[PDB]
Design a protein around this ligand. Structure first.
Ligand SMILES: Nc1nc2c(ncn2[C@@H]2O[C@H](COP(=O)(O)OP(=O)(O)OP(=O)(O)O)[C@@H](O)[C@H]2O)c(=O)[nH]1
Lengths: 634, 135, 238, 246, 440
RNA sequence: GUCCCUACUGAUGAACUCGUCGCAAUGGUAAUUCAGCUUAGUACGAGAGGAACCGCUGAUUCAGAUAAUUGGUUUUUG
RNA sequence: UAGAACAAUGUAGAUAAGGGAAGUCGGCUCCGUAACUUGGUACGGACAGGGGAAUCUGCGAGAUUCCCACUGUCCCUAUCUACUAUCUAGCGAAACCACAGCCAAGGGAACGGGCUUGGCAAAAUCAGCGGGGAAAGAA
RNA sequence: GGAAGUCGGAAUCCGCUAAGGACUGUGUAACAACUCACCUGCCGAAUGUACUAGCCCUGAAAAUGGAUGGCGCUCAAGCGU
């Protein structure tokens, strides 16, 4: 049943830099306590995102930050938060609020904020699913200053207390790209409607989907969207090759890359490795298929796909960063989620629809002046997207071996592969598919996924399609890759002449002509036989540019505003009094009644009395005494 | 080919759709979750169920994280719901347990923890090979 | 097997021992079977069979007459092809990016006007159901006609125009509606009915005038009912 | 002499059969094709008995024994024991044992000289096997697989072990058993050698899906079909093996 | 595996009849003028849409069933290009795709028209208009459907050629003895007729040697012409020769019985060698019965020897009529293919880094034999009846009675009742068939 | 801004002396699908693969019974 | 108002008492001591635990196995509330009522209950009741 | 490549004539072979092509069981005078 039960978990990662249409620490001037906390943490120099963002946040401007995971966005918005709050407030009502996608991300934010505010009297609360709604009631009674929450639970508690958020002045959206991918849009909009207009809005993300751009335009007051510069210029130290590959030879071509074009050692390796190969794919089914195929071939491979378990992703990523696995296969969304260290080797299995997505996946490497390699497998159907990539990068295309020494780093050089081994590899793939049934089932699943992904993938441009047809007609599509060698160029050419002049044959008559059908074919042939600078550069205006609905926790459809009253019943349960209205001093007796446990939070909390002792049972008196102890504890 | 066993006699089915199960092999999963039964007949609101030796489709709920949240065929080897064998013997097991098996009938693991049902051992020759206790 | 194995098996072992007799009997029984079919089977299948046998006998009679004659004895496609190749080459080469965005349509304009005006007078809207031609993508109509709504699904922009003397039909753009001889209001709004005079672009035909000149627009009478037939057919008045 | 057969349509011969140097046990079911193949290969040279164990057809995986004796699990009933005793000559001692691990054919592999057992059998069972079979019983796991009865086939002329046994494990096992061992596959890649084959000093019966290269390997290892079959054939004509099982 | 599973392609009239009958018989066909205008619109738009998705499903099946020429192996691509004119193939497929698109657009426009219709007459006319316009489209796509049907039939009959496997390309001049060897070596029914271009396609047969499976591809026949003025069937052969990693067996005909000259045969082989650049070339003197090699002119002998003195092109001898040496040439070529492929596989396993591959070490583990160090063997208790035994043979008249024969004589499979006490060896033979007391 | 009549269907019933054993006008009507063994790795097929008739054994649903056995329910207040 | 039969029901609404199911983002640092500038640095110790059910060896460092999450979600079980009732002795209404009351076709006025011509059709009752004997007015 | 009337394009004649097409189909890889067209011998007397006019079948049908009023009617108890 649950094969494609809902949808391919990694859908797409759409990015819009047209969203650009929005518009030391001591030298930055932080408080002494915050400075000592940062010194304890070890943030000697702020990361580039911090350096560009924190001054703006201190200048009280709403900002959207394009930054990779692990760039330090968490501290980037927590340090200004602590600097702004700087003390616990005796007036009831919180003013710091952050919305995070998942509980793990929320806990990471909790750890960051605690370590960055050790000593300061700020009260920070976590509000995520799986915890007791009563416990969250008690924490709101403790009256925190900072709220770190997941939006669904946030609305649940919002509806349950009818809380007043007018005191909130500081609002942060962490990983809003994940928020919108998981589908938090409507409830986020209702949160925004609840929030007072007089607030400072921070939004940290790695990508800017058009939905997120519209949300920012709707909810942000003059956003000074930010970004870096490694998110534009493909590091010139990146050297790229493109391989014309066939559908049935795709896996064989991927291993020739690994074997003869990369010299990838087999077995467990004896901080990434010297090789450091990442593989970017189209869906999780390709992820599993390629991972298992590589593992059978003998390659130390870790796989990370979209809807993978948290612990599993953690283990695989930790192995890749420690160098226990040298190949890492990711789709797009898992890649964006995981913090990828410096890489030397990038392989694009399925071509990306967006040249900007290609730019991200290749800026994954060739960093800090260290040279990087990018090999991309392209098919005839993906050739228009390759040409769109050409237009985006403004580089020249070299097809096959039109130039003797093409510069693969600055030129987009496309070629085929060593026919000899390519075939010895494709035969191996066919053999393993015929032998291992699990691999065959996986291959069929990825075939269906390929069909679905081709159906749902965004289209190319008309000019790209036309010139793709022209390239396919041209000779440059079918010869070797410049890398191989001029001697190969010699030997390939020794017979390529006759081979090509055989491939380019126009039959005089079909085997059917060799009846009414024969007459129809002859008429068909007769019908469809072949058909018989000067400008001023200074001023030449050119053409190209230079009851509302929300989903509940149970998943069953639930109305937007449904006050179950169980908060009032909570009040009745624990005989409490009226909650402190916004502004009134925190009530220490209620704080002591419901403040917090003694530290570590266990989960295993059932105290059940044992069954009544039986005389015929062996441990009669012992069971009787434990039952007596249980009734004494009550 | 649908994994419906042939020659299976009537016995009481006590493991309906959506049923939590122990995992008896060394494959890396601890529990399974029956969602569908092979060879079942859709009646009005009738929940399909399977007895010892019947192939089902199960999803792992706990175990090795790499295999977690994955769906595999399985065949059940131990059933706590009592049923009668043709020698007139009504019997039941301590828990509910099965083993992950490919659609042809081969096990992913290499050993079975605990006894194996006689019906499953007779229907699937591989389980008879990977079984140490047969009752 | 790998090749023409049925003829291979035929050449090695032959046919069934009564295939030829079976075929001859079936061919002889064809006449009785045809009469039985014509007199018995009933309901849309008779209608289909009858309409078929009519076509077959007409074809057979024409073939017999042609054979008798020959035994006794001892352009519009070209013009249309020229037009289509001219258009195809123009489109293929001389295409460069240029702004072209259509204004929002009369339906959502009316919806916005309704949002601006609470009290809806009964029957304040009446959608024009007959097919129309508008021209410009966006236009603000006068108050006099600001209450006729012409749907996009009914709007047309091209018509199949037939030239009699140069006997050929060409799909040509519609320039303007000159007279609809059923209602002056329909003429003003662009309602497209039968026998309707429209102005059609005759650029691709290449009509030479008395001054030797090339025609770029002529009158055409629409001669069908576009409301019933989802297309516009007109005959040039030349 | 290596032959191919199926019980009903299943390639697993060792599940439904048990072959030794003095008797043959065949699962009883429907037709007589399996019994006929076995008798046409053993034309009354040794007794062949249509038997059921614990009311099952898995007699091959439920029975363990050699030319000198036969052992059955405690679940086997007195009528089945009477059938076995009446069909088998007096030169063969039959005994029923109360092993916790009832799958004797899966936990014990025994030739006429040595037996390899699951390391978790009882002491009483270990020396009762040593008594009934009159062999040397060793506890060991092959290829980290604890079911030696299903993962190894043994004879007095050779032994076929799990395809993924290491060289150290293989030569250690060869040292203890005293016969050559080769890691090979049966029934087109299946790893259950014991469950897919019964073999004795002059006969092997495998499944119909067993490929020609691995059948030749089987014949060479067990020295079958007269010829030579020392295993030196396997060493010499390595081209077939490297091409087929690459 | 093959292309026999491509669904049949109907003609234009059959397609129209299928689609317009499905829409007639799978939907209700009675609406009344006294019903609501909304329900009339719904009825007619349902009819139009249903016809649309029916046509779209059939066209999509046609587009997706036929193999894509791009993603095929080069041999198959060139073979289909020669046999079917990939240009016309793509043209017809594009016509099908464009017709699908236009049918979809027609359906959309007429659905809008039906939305804005106000009479049952108008909805009827608009429905008949839509279905009628689409039928015009199919009638226009009459001829491509016929071409697609013919190509589908030939593709379903086409042999399965495995591009990357142990293969013997059997080639030569016409009437040399190609089919005569292929039938002698394999079970392929390839006509051996004494006329010229008897074989009009590639035939494939299968062989077993040293427990390995071999493919043998009989080619039609090549004449002495440049590769540009070259006929279709024999370019099918040259494509087979050009895109198959193989051992090419070129047949030579010493006699002039073939109909061609020795010098012409040498010229043709020299012309085709560039395609046999690295493929293993074995020229075997076919028809060595009539004119043996010894009875041959010395300068021609020396030309053949000079042909030997080039690369690893070697010449053998066989008569495919006297069953003389076809066996020997078979074993020679098959063994040398085996040794070449094992050499290549071991080289591929041994990488420049020096690390032995997983597959290579698995092969080593499977090929190693373990022997006890003590060097002592174990006794074998084999009875003498085994050596004094007689093979059972089903064709023998006086066989053993056998259980299959007795059960077939005494009933069937679920009818014969077996007596389990027949083999009971007891003290007294009459004590069998005795009922055992069990409970007292 | 508006408890009765009849239909269905059991269960009774006066008149023919009561009772026993029967006939059968008319009305209703019931079985359904799949799998396994043998045929048979046979016909067919280059290969890959791959049936059917006779015979035999089961299972799904539907229908009509039943309480040996095995579970469940206790106002038996045992 | 009292006797007989079996008499513990069902529905609905509330109620934190429990269970089955569905969804998931569910299962798996601190104290003391020593130097340094009030806060950090190293060393030592503890933490990152219980409850219930069980199994195996001779209470035993006893060893081994299984279960503990929330949800504005559904259902079920549990408590409370209200209405829930066959016959017999006595007493004893009301609504409603032109007359009636078996079907099918036809009876131009989207009209049939009485007419045509057809199916048919046998007293008097009891219980169950799910059909009919109620409906428009039209821009 | 092969194409002999019959995979294809164009012309499509003459002789013998009783008559025979540079061929109407089957068939061969091509032949070959059969067959049709046309002609002769036997038979022996009316045929056979296209239309028209009656009656009849078909020319479309759903959904409770029913209707030339019903039974029923066939050289009528139907149709025409
Ligand atoms: N005497 C003799 N005749 C042979 C020999 N090989 C083939 N022939 C004859 O050659 C004729 C047919 O040869 P094929 O095998 O069909 O020739 P081919 O090279 O396959 O070419 P195709 O004719 O196109 O199939 C028959 O008459 C055979 O008897 C041979 O070795 N000796």
């Amino acid at each position: 049943m649950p094969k494609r039960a809902v949808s391919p978990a990694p859908s797409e990662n759409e990015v819009d830099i047209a969203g650009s249409l929005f518009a030391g620490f001591q030298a930055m001037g932080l408080d002494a306590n915050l400075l000592r906390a940062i010194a304890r943490k070890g943030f000697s120099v702020p990361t580039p995102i911090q350096r560009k963002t924190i001054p703006l946040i201190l200048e009280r401007r709403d900002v959207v930050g394009m930054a990779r995971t692990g760039s330090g966005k968490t501290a980037a918005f927590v340090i200004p938060m602590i600097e702004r709050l700087k003390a616990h407030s005796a007036r009831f009502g919180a003013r710091a609020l952050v919305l995070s996608p998942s509980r793990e991300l929320a806990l990471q934010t909790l750890k960051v904020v605690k370590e960055l505010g050790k000593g300061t009297d700020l009260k920070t609360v976590l509000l995520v699913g799986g915890d007791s709604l009563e416990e969250q009631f008690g924490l709101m009674a403790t009256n925190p200053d900072i709220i770190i929450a997941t939006p669904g639970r946030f609305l649940h508690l919002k509806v349950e207390m009818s809380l007043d958020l007018s005191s909130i002045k500081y609002v942060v959206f962490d990983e809003a790209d994940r928020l919108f991918e998981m589908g938090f849009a409507a409830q986020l909009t209702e949160i925004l409607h609840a929030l007072p207009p007089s607030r400072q809005t921070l939004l940290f993300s790695a990508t800017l989907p058009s939905s997120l751009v519209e949300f920012t335009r709707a909810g942000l007051q003059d956003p000074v969207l930010v970004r870096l510069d490694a998110e534009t210029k493909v590091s010139p130290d990146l050297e790229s090759a493109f391989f014309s590959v066939k559908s049935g030879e795709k896996e064989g071509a991927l291993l020739h890359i690994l074997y003869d074009i990369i010299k990838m050692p087999l077995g467990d390796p004896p901080k990434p490795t010297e090789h450091s190969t990442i593989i970017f794919t189209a869906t999780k089914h390709h992820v599993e298929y390629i991972s298992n195929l590589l593992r059978l071939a003998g390659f130390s491979v870790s796989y990370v796909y979209g809807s993978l378990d948290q612990t599993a992703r953690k283990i695989q990523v930790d192995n890749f960063r420690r160098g226990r696995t040298n190949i890492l296969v990711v789709t797009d969304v898992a890649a964006r989620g995981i913090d990828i260290p410096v890489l030397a080797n990038v392989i694009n299995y399925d071509f990306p629809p967006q040249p900007k997505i290609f730019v991200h996946r290749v800026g994954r490497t060739a960093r800090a002046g260290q040279r990087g390699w990018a090999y991309a497998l392209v098919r005839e159907s993906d050739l228009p997207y390759l040409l769109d990539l050409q237009l985006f990068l403004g580089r020249r295309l070299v097809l096959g071996r039109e130039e003797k020494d093409p510069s693969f780093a600055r030129d987009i050089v496309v070629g085929s592969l060593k026919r000899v081994e390519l075939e010895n590899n494709v035969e191996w793939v066919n053999k393993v598919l015929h032998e291992n049934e699990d691999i065959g089932a996986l291959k069929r699943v990825t075939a269906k996924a390929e069909k679905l992904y081709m159906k749902t993938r965004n289209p190319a441009s008309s000019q790209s399609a036309k010139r793709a047809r022209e390239v396919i007609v041209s000779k440059g599509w079918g010869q070797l890759h410049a890398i191989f060698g001029e001697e190969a160029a010699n030997e390939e050419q020794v017979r390529d002449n006759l081979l090509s002049k055989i491939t380019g044959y126009k039959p005089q008559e079909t085997i059917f002509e060799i009846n009414k059908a024969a007459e129809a074919v002859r008429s068909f042939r007769q019908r469809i036989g072949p058909r018989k600078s000067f400008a001023d550069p200074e001023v030449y205006m050119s053409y190209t540019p230079r009851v509302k609905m929300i989903r509940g926790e149970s998943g069953v459809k639930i109305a937007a505003s449904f006050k179950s009253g169980r908060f009032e019943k909570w009040r009745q349960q624990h005989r409490l009094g009226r909650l402190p209205q916004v502004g009134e001093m925190e009530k220490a007796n209620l704080v002591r009644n419901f403040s917090l446990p003694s530290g570590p939070r266990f989960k295993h909390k059932q105290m059940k009395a044992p069954k009544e002792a039986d005389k015929w049972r062996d441990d009669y008196e012992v069971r009787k005494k434990r039952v007596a102890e249980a009734k004494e504890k009550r | 080919k649908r994994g419906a066993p042939g020659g299976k006699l009537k016995m009481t089915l006590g493991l309906p759709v959506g049923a939590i199960m122990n995992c008896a092999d060394n494959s890396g999963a601890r529990n399974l979750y029956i969602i569908a039964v092979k060879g079942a007949g859709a009646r009005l609101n009738r929940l399909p169920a399977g007895g010892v030796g019947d192939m089902v489709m199960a999803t792992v709920k706990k175990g090795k994280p790499e295999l977690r949240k994955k769906v595999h065929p399985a065949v059940i080897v131990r059933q706590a719901k009592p049923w009668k064998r043709f020698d007139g013997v009504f019997l039941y097991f301590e828990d509910n347990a099965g083993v992950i098996v490919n659609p042809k009938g081969e096990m992913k693991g290499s050993a079975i923890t605990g006894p194996v049902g006689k019906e499953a051992a007779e229907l699937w020759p591989r389980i008879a090979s990977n079984a140490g206790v047969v009752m | 097997p790998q090749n023409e194995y049925i003829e291979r098996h035929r050449k090695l072992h032959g046919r069934r021992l009564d295939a030829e007799e079976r075929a001859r009997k079936k061919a002889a029984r064809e006449g009785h079977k045809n009469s039985e079919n014509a007199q018995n089977l009933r309901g849309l299948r008779a209608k289909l069979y009858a309409k078929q046998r009519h076509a077959q006998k007409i074809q057979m009679r024409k073939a017999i007459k042609q054979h008798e004659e020959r035994n006794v004895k001892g352009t519009a496609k070209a013009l249309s092809s020229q037009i289509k190749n001219k258009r195809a080459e123009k489109a293929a080469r001389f295409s460069v990016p240029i702004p072209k965005v259509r204004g929002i349509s009369e339906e959502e304009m009316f919806k916005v006007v309704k949002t601006g005006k609470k009290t809806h007078k009964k029957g304040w809207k009446r959608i024009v159901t007959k097919p129309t031609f508008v021209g410009p993508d966006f236009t603000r109509r006068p108050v006099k006609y600001e209450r006729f709504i012409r749907p996009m699904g009914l709007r047309y922009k091209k018509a199949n125009v037939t030239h009699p003397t140069l006997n050929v039909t060409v799909q040509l753009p519609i320039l303007s509606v000159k007279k609809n001889p059923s209602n002056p209001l329909y003429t003003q709004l662009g309602v497209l009915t039968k026998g309707t005079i429209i102005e059609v672009n005759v650029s691709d035909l290449g009509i030479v005038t008395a001054s030797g000149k090339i025609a770029w627009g002529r009158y055409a009478q629409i001669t069908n009912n576009p409301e019933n037939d989802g297309c516009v057919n007109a005959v040039l008045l030349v | 002499m290596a032959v191919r057969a199926q019980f009903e349509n299943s390639n697993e011969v060792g599940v439904f059969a048990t072959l030794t140097n003095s008797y043959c046990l065949v699962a009883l079911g429907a037709s007589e094709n399996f019994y006929s193949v076995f008798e046409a290969e053993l034309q009354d040279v040794i007794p062949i008995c249509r038997t059921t164990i614990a009311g099952t057809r898995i007699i091959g995986r439920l029975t363990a024994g050699n030319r000198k004796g036969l052992l059955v699990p405690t679940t086997t009933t007195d009528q089945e024991l009477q059938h076995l005793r009446n069909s088998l000559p007096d030169d063969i001692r039959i005994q029923r044992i109360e092993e916790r691990l009832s799958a004797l054919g899966n936990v014990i592999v025994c030739n006429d000289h040595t037996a390899l057992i699951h390391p978790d059998l009882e002491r009483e069972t270990e020396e009762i096997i040593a008594d009934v079979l009159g062999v040397e019983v060793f506890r060991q796991t092959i290829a980290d697989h604890v079911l030696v009865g299903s993962y190894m086939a043994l004879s007095n002329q050779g032994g076929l072990v799990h395809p993924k046994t290491s060289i150290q494990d293989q030569d250690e096992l060869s040292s203890l058993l005293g016969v050559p061992l080769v890691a090979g596959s049966v029934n087109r890649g299946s790893n259950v050698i014991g469950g897919g084959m019964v073999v004795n000093d002059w006969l092997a019966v495998t499944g119909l899906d067993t490929t020609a290269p691995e059948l030749s390997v089987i014949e060479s290892v067990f020295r079958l079909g007269e010829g030579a079959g020392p295993g030196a054939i396997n060493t010499s004509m390595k081209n077939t093996i490297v091409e087929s099982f690459y | 595996t093959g292309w026999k599973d491509i669904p049949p392609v109907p003609t234009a009239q059959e397609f129209i009849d299928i689609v317009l009958s499905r829409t007639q018989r799978r939907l209700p066909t009675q609406i009344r003028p006294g019903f609501k205008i909304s329900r009339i619109r719904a009825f007619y738009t349902r009819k139009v849409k249903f016809t649309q998705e029916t046509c779209s499903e059939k066209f999509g099946a046609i587009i997706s069933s036929f193999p894509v020429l791009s993603d095929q192996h080069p041999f198959h691509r060139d073979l289909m290009n020669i046999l079917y004119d990939a240009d016309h193939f793509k043209v017809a497929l594009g016509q099908i795709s464009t017709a699908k698109n236009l049918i979809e657009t027609i359906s959309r426009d007429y659905v809008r028209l039906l939305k804005y219709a106000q009479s049952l007459y108008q909805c009827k006319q608009l429905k008949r208009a839509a279905l009628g316009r689409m039928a015009t489209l199919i009638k226009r796509l009459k001829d491509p459907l016929i071409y697609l049907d013919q190509v589908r039939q030939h593709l379903a009959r086409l042999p399965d050629i495995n591009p990357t496997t142990r293969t013997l390309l059997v080639a030569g001049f016409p009437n040399v003895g190609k089919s005569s060897f292929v039938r002698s070596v394999t079970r392929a029914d390839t006509p051996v007729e004494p006329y010229a271009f008897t074989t009009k396609s590639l035939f494939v047969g299968h062989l077993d040697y040293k427990y390995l499976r071999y493919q043998v591809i009989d080619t039609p026949g090549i004449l002495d012409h440049p590769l540009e003025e070259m006929n279709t069937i024999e370019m099918q052969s040259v494509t087979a020769l050009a895109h198959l990693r193989a051992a090419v067996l070129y047949f030579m005909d010493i006699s002039e019985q073939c109909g061609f000259s020795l010098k012409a045969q040498i010229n043709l082989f020299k012309s085709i060698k560039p395609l046999f650049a690295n493929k293993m070339v074995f020229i075997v003197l076919n028809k060595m019965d009539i004119k043996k090699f010894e009875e041959l002119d010395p300068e021609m002998q020396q030309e053949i020897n000079d042909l030997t003195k080039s690369g690893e092109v070697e010449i053998l001898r066989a008569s495919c009529a006297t069953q003389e040496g076809v066996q020997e040439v078979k074993n020679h070529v098959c063994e040398r293919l085996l040794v070449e492929r094992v050499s290549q596989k071991l080289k591929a396993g041994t990488h420049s880094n020096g690390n032995i591959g997983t597959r290579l070490q698995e092969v080593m583990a499977r090929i190693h034999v373990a022997t006890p160090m003590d060097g002592t063997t174990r006794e074998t208790f084999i009875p003498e009846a085994v050596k004094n035994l007689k093979k059972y043979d089903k064709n023998d008249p006086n066989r053993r009675v056998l259980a299959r024969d007795i059960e077939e004589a005494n009933g069937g499979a679920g009818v014969f009742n077996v007596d389990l006490r027949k083999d009971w060896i007891l003290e007294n033979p009459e004590w069998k068939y005795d009922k055992i007391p069990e409970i007292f």
